[PDB]
Amino acid sequence: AHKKGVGSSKNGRDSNPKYLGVKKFGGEVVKAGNILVRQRGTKFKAGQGVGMGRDHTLFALSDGKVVFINKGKGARFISIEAAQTE
RNA sequence: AGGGAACUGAAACAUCUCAGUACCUGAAGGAGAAGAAAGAGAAUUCGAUUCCGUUAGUAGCGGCGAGCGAACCCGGAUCAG
RNA sequence: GACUGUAAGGUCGUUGUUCGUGAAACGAUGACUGAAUCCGCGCGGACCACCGCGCAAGGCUAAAUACUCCCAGUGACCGAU
RNA sequence: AGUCAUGGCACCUUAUGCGUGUUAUGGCGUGCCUAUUGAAGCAUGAGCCGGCGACUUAGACCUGACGUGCGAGCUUAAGUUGAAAAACGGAGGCGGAGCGAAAGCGAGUCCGAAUAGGGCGGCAUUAGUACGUCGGGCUAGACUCGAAACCAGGUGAGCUAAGCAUGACCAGGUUGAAACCCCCGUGACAGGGGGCGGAGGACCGAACCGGUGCCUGCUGAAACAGUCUCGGAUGAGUUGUGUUUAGGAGUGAAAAGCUAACCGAACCUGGAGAUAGCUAGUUCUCCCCGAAAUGUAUUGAGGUACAGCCUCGGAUGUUGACCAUGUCCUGUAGAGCACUCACAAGGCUAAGGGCACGUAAUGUGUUCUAAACCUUAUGAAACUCCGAAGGGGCACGCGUUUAGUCCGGGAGUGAGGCUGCGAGAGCUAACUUCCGUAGCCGAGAGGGAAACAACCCAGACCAUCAGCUAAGGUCCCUAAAUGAUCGCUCAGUGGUUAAGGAUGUGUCGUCGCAUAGACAGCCAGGAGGUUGGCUUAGAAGCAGCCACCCUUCAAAGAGUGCGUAAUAGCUCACUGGUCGAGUGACGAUGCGCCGAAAAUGAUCGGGGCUCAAGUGAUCUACCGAAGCUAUGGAUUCAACUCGCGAAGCGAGUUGUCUGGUAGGGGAGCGUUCAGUCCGCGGAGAAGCCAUACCGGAAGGAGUGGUGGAGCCGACUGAAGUGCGGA
RNA sequence: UAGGCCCAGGCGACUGUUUACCAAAAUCACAGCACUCUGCCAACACGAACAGUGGACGUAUAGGGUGUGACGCCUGCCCGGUGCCGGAAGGUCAAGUGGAGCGGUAAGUGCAAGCAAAGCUGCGAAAUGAAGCCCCGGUGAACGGCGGCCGUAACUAUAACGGUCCUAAGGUAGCGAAAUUCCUUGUCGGGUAAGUUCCGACCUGCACGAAAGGCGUAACGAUCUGGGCGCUGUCUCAACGAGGGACUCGGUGAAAUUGAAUUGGCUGUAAAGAUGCGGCCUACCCGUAGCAGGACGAAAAGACCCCGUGGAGCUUUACUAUAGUCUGGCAUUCAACGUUGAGACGUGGUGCGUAGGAUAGGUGGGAGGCGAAGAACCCUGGCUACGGCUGGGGGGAGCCGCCGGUGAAAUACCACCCUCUACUUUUUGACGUUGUAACCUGAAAAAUCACUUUCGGGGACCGUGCUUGGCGGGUAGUUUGACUGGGGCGGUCGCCUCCCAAAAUGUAACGGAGGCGCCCAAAGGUCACCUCAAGACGGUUGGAAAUCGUCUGUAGAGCGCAAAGGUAGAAGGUGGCUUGACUGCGAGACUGACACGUCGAGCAGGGAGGAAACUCGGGCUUAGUGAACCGGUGGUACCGUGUGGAAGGGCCAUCGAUCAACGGAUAAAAGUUACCCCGGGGAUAACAGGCUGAUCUCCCCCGAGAGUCCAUAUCGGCGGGGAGGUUUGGCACCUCGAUGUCGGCUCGUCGCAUCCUGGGGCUGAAGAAGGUCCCAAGGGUUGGGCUGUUCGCCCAUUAAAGCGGCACGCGAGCUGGGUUCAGAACGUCGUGAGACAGUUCGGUCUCUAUCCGCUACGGGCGCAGGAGAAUUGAGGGGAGUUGCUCCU
RNA sequence: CCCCCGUGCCCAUAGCACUGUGGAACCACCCCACCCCAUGCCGAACUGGGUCGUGAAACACAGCAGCGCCAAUGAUACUCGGACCGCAGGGUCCCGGAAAAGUCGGUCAGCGCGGGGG
Fold first, then answer.
1. Helix/strand/coil (H, E, C) string of chain A?
2. How many Å from the CA of A83 to C1' of D55?
3. Nucleotide nearest to A59 (CA to C1')
């Protein structure tokens, strides 16, 4: 194509955010937080990041994978009250 | 047989589908046309053309696109020089 | 009964075939090659090896398949714009 | 146009104050089709009558409901029979374990170094299949039609015309030139006079060819003219008839004119209907349900695909949404500020720069933002350690109901509007335009709103001149208390309107004060240093710059405003006194106005209102919806029995029975063809004209009339089965 | 009975053509000359067919195409570039010949891996080489340009002149607002008073000119403009009369069209242009004459336009076919002849591992090989990595097979294939040369064909076939993309950052800003230490700044390039070791209907750092991502239509497109119509309304400033509230089953804000006369010049010459007059066909009125017995302007 | 109940500054230096061996506001929702959730956790 001044005719662009696991919901190794398409492991989404926080959640099953370096993953040992078995 | 485009479709669009179709011209009987061959098949089988029955609506073809489409096994009229 | 019933493959350019032709023999043409010539010759989809079958050389073959000017008869059609 | 509505004349195929044939008039009320978001339109189609009135017909083209054949299943070709047939018939394919490129493998499977995974025999498993009508689709124009354009062939060119031939049309006048001849200034001889001559698309202009402009008139005379002005008229003139040229060529004065009244490539028979996402339409009457102009795709846009979005078969044995509650977050709105951009004032900042008699940085010194630290203390969509409504996630539990739960036959037509919620292009303007979120109209009526898609109230089974609620109203034209205290009250605003204003007004706080009976309307005091220095003519209280000290007396303004080049004059103010019971300047709710003057004629629906029936606060009740209860009756899904030895059917009852545009499941009226015809009709049916029984509508019914020979019936299948409207 | 007259400016030299029905003009049309070619049984035409003639029955001062068109003077610098001929060192071309070579097999071998004629086939090109593509030469009544920028004595001004860009060049005869000027109707002057006009010139002539020319230039052309001469009595009032239609009567009476009329209006309302709607007022009903505002008048479903993956038509190098035309190849072209190349048959014929009488890739036969065609031996000339190829002569009657050895082999005589050769024969591009068997042009038998009988003749040439290259719109099928806050030049077409997006997801946009389709053997993995810009302390080449020590440092660096988020325990910097930017997996997740991309503990193998630990699908990510057929290759048996290989296929992986129109879809493509036809259309423009109210006319706010000073006699820096809105429009709502600009006469009738009276406020107004404002209509408002004119200014008037009405009133009047329908000319342009609300010349124009309604006259009905006629009345209309003498 | 090397909870009701003090068991400096380790240079915080000395700012403890730092249901600002003034904002009431500064206080905590002592 070809363009100049006093006019312009250019497109625009975005993508799908798509958070996914919706907080206190079962667990397993869903996904959630496509802030970074590459992503990484997480085990158990505690809700980290800079400053005090961490998502009030606690709900064991499996690994997790989440977001970027932006906020925070989890990996915590603890189901919620459970700790012995299952 | 000499015979030859073409609106269409491919969502338009020169290979293409129509196809060898419209038309022209030559022949005879109300029958001419392929029909007994340097052949089809395929287990180391089967003979004279064509039609439809079933396959195969397969193989292939193919701006690799719509699309056209045998032989492998089959009926009878005929399984005669 | 009157007659006598037994003397061409090929190359290059291409049409077809289902094959828009190219990864393929096979009908044939445009100019060039009339070789083989018999355990020699035509091809199995180019060629190698072995098999299979057919042999330059010209036609006849009625019967069905496909047709519908006329003569009886026949169909859950119309009704004389 | 309407339907009802009291009357009104008639009749009474049953006195029975009950009806038949009807109308002044009242409520008001705008048609149908049908491509439309959208109207009732002037948006379009329509004078009527009679018919044609289309997605179907053959195709193992396929998927699927139901009934049936079979569980190990179902058949083509015609050969024999032959007014039916039919068994005989594995040509044959589909179902069948599968996977794999396939090979081949294997009840298990592609990966290679292979318990971990997607499909499969498998499997808490149908292994089925054929016939029929049928959901969509398919091979064909096969929903039809409306296009100019491409072709094969063929037909005249007597239309306008080139080329070929034989004949033809032209009354005169004017100009009257070259040739011929005698003479001559003339050697030769070029040249000069005229005579006759006879030339010239010359002259007027009849006939002859074709025409520059008005006119009548475009159903006019005629799908075609008439009146007046010209040239060709001793000629690039015209003409009778005959004739090859032609289509993708000729003719041709070139206009891109003509081939026979349109040639951007003739006509007619023929090739295909050019095909068509364009667009007109696509026929009788229906019971319960129901939408998109949002996103992804496109040489793609009012084209089309699919998905959320509808109906239906099967299903999802606890998974629904709401809530009380647990728990985590998003970080708008805003605060606030200290990394971002900029913000105001002060201290200070000039490692800063220059005005400056300097001058080894210049030691000396100065002046101002300016970076910018603190303070004072600024903004914001794209600011920071803050912070929520709301919402989601699941969980605890049941209140109404299948909410949680996929595979499929088939949709729609993609191009809307408005109020609320906020921005984008934007004089925050636009039923302009982009977006999402509730509703609304595309698919349903009203009161209010003058009548009028989204606005306040409300969405229906058909019938009753039965009741109340909300809005709207309580004066009238057409319902409903000018019933109750009272202001702005007076403009007719209230019924199109504002920045700026006028000492109009019900009512809350101060003030110098008329319980010194103040000022606001007077009598008398009304001049001295200085009448101030200065621009100087004087400016002397007043053309100017600046400035305000005291005096007679108990006090009195460096002078407002008058005259004016500038004195004189009256006075802004103070003092002795004279009736003297409150004046003047703003915030606060509520009103009228100066702006708040258009064009057809008024611009609250109208009447008309200060008996405010203009607005606001109270209290009871009414008027007042097809929204709800009563009553007969429907449709439909579910819900507690019952009547079932032959196709299934419901009262008793509760919600749904909504209205429905593309659609899903579903019933029929009847005509033609066919089955059985004992048949129905001479008192004569069928053809037709009219009478209040029933039916979900469509329609079936009672009888004559007339008419002349047949005609339809139940159980059944078939058919070009049905708009007036193209 | 019949040229109107004259001067002048624009075009054409006048007779000819025709818009067959709007339009006859400066348009084409004539000899002369300009470019030629053909140059003959000719070019060319139609004809595939040549047969045919036209050409002409001709061969040239002849004909086919192209330019202007009397005659008179003249006609040019850019050949960079389109087009033509020319020249031939050479560079680019050929399908069938093209040694070798490679790719599939196969009787050899063997232990198999593995390597073999090749009277098979592809791969494969030396070479061959005719045009054309480079150039060299030219080439203008061929196309085309005829350029730009700085200054110069004049006060200034263009100014004979300076530098240079472009060069391919690079403006002169005439005219110069003339049928090339936007910008302006230019600027001075004639004509009456005067102008978008006629001219006479000037010259800063949008973008005049050399042959589709420039000017000149008489008559003549139904071409535009100026005036006048008498007139046209057109306009003012035109006036009156006639023959015929409008009315009495007899008969005939259709078509275009259409739902339906108890069919009055307002103002309002409605997809706003309502009469059946709202609310109000109003008519005794009907007939016919007449008139246009009226139904969104009629007709073909606008044909101006847009949409339509419609058609036709023309042109251009659009993609490309193609006759035709230009070139090469063999035959109807036969022996010879000067020949470079080339194949075979024939002798045969290079070969140095010692030695073998002797220096070997040879076999069967063999008992005798050579020699009067002269044989041991010698001389001697030619290519020798030192072998060899022959003659003659010197000697003339003499040299050779077998039990020899060794060598891959023992031999000659008849053969021998290989890299390889010169001819006695044959075949083959040939260049040049005689003759005669394809052929065609001039006598004789019914005379231009057909036989042509001896025909001269020249002769392999002319040419048909299939193949090739070039040209070619001569002819053909299509594209030419689309979007679209309208056509559309421009601008847009994929991915990524958000602002605005409406605190989960969460869209748009001719709303806005930054870019890209990478980097990197390392900014990758491991282990370790180190906080960055930034100020201050004064000290170096050190007139800031670069050097260092220091505290501070919500750390303000940097981490590969927008942006957001992350950022020390550093993903940050540095540095040693070294790469899993590995493979086979993978419960459970988001993304989207599909497309699928993103997450990752853990399993399997062998590895790296590393004690171990820990990490290891290149690294912060999202932008560096990225298509199916076809093809490029090694594994792969997994096979392969006869079977075994094998043309092939798939699989492992992988490479070919600024397609940067990025879901593209083909690999494959332009312009043009005002002659158009259709499909629809204001759900797809423009001319009217319309929501709106930008700009338009008018008033409001107090203080600066005029007025001697001095706000308002009158205005008002800056700005503030709106009524109207018909100022050019923003909206695309029904109008495309179609409503045709503007203006002119006339009818005009509304409104007022008042254009001229009137009575009033003031007046910085003595009068005369005004300057602004207040109030309502009572009235009324010219003629000349041009234009189509709205407008506009020029001349005089006028009490003054209005403003907003009405789709800027209206063809159911005409007019078109401009221009805006098709013709031609100019100006620049597109290559050409062609483009312009740029300029100019002409240039048909409607239509049987039932009617609503209005100007009229009648048929009647009528308030109560029937009647001729005379009457007072609501009220419906008519219903108005003004200068000037004289007089206190 | 003593002093005290130390692991968390944590994350400014433990940032800094003022007084002083303990050293012998806690902890600093140091000493010696060639060799393990081999520091951008050296071996100084990264080095092998330890009995002087001292604890000085650095190591510890309580008092300890100069400002930080936690700092409230309470009025405001903000908000699911109801009719309204009213011009969009903005605004009345009803009316729930319910910032911040400002009001005090406190700040140099506190509990398990391995010890060298009278």
1. CCCCCCCCCCCCCCCCCCCCCCCCCCCCCCCCCCCCCCCCCCCCCCCCCCCCCCCCCCCCCCCCCCCCCCCCCCCCCCCCCCCCCC
2. 70
3. D394
